[PDB]
Design a protein around this ligand. Structure first.
Ligand SMILES: *[C@@H]1O[C@H](CO)[C@@H](O)[C@H](O)[C@H]1NC(C)=O
Ligand SMILES: NCC(=O)c1ccc(Br)cc1
Ligand SMILES: NCC(=O)c1ccc(Br)cc1
Ligand code: NA
Ligand code: NA
Lengths: 250, 10, 28
């Protein structure tokens, strides 16, 4: 995260770290949506241009964390993966359309002060809150600048951007399964996700029921925190039917 | 860079 | 799911984090 700040303890208890077993390293963020399901970006698991195609046994998820590098004894919980599910129409060839994956854990995780699931949006919450100018929150352990790494989880609040501005910022084909967020050059304030943050959550706190909802998944950007560029997020609500089908079947 | 995790998880 | 999105160290105690008000103020 660029131009963010240190998270408070327990500020994002749904935040998950995707961790490679060997070599041991951070791969991506992710989020806890129930005691046995974790949501991330499909490109964190499958990206053939980079020879990336992880299997369950290659990976662990670490839940309840604050420090990036420490083993947080008696606080974090480490879970093995039972099964990975990637959206069948994830478009890794062109633009990361439908950049979403689910990971089922081998055993349920126990909730705690540090471990608690985020809500997924219903149609009405999405329609009400996914409006230009409305801010969400992005969290992660990724790099602090494009060209460096944080001691603890970072957090930044960013406004959703008007769809024409998102489209006019890039040559990539933008789809209805994406939204973009970030400040404009004239707004002064700054901030963005960066390498290592992808797959983590873009959340909003509903003013109707005072619950946190995951509206986006950190998906892609061109650089980090560049003027006139914006970060792109998977539109979680638009893909809810697939999420539900997976959880119902499996 | 990362602190070793317990062997039980590997 | 019934308890989703309510943080033990914040909403469940009626404590606010340092920047959530920035989000609320944007929901015009
Ligand atoms: C990714 O790897 C899995 C398991 O090896 C394989 O079944 C699948 O076809 C691969 N996908 C691509 C796009 O290479
Ligand atoms: N070969 C895939 C490719 O060039 C690509 C470029 C930009 C995004 Br966003 C996603 C994929
Ligand atoms: N290359 C920069 C990067 O990894 C990135 C990923 C997701 C967002 Br949103 C913004 C930037
Ligand atoms: Na364009
Ligand atoms: Na920018």
């Amino acid at each position: 995260i660029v131009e963010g700040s240190d998270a408070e303890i327990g500020m994002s208890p749904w935040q998950v770290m995707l961790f490679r077993k060997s070599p041991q390293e951070l791969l991506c963020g992710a989020s806890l949506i129930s005691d046995r399901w974790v949501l991330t970006a499909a490109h964190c698991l499958l990206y053939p241009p980079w020879d990336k195609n992880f299997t369950e046994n290659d990976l662990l998820v670490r839940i309840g964390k604050h420090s990036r590098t420490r083993y947080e004894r008696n606080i974090e919980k480490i879970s093995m993966l039972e099964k990975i599910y990637i959206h069948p129409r994830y478009n890794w060839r062109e633009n990361l359309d439908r950049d979403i994956a689910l990971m089922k854990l081998k055993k349920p995780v126990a909730f705690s002060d540090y471990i608690h699931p985020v809500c997924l949006p219903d149609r009405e919450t999405a329609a009400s809150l996914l409006q230009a100018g409305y801010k969400g929150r992005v969290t992660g352990w990724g790099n602090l600048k494009e060209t460096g790494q944080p001691s603890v989880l970072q957090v930044v609040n960013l406004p959703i951007v008007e769809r024409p501005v998102c489209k006019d910022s890039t040559r990539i084909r933008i789809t209805d399964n994406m939204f973009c967020a970030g400040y404009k050059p004239d707004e002064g304030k700054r901030g963005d996700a960066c390498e290592g943050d992808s797959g983590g959550p873009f959340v909003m706190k509903s003013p109707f029921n005072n619950r946190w909802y995951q509206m986006g998944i950190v998906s892609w950007g061109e650089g980090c925190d560049r003027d006139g560029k914006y970060g792109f997020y998977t539109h979680v609500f638009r893909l809810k039917k697939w999420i539900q089908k997976v959880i119902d079947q499996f | 860079d990362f602190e070793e995790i317990p062997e039980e998880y590997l | 799911e019934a308890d989703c999105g309510l943080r033990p160290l914040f909403e469940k105690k009626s404590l606010e984090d340092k920047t959530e008000r920035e989000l609320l103020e944007s929901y015009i």
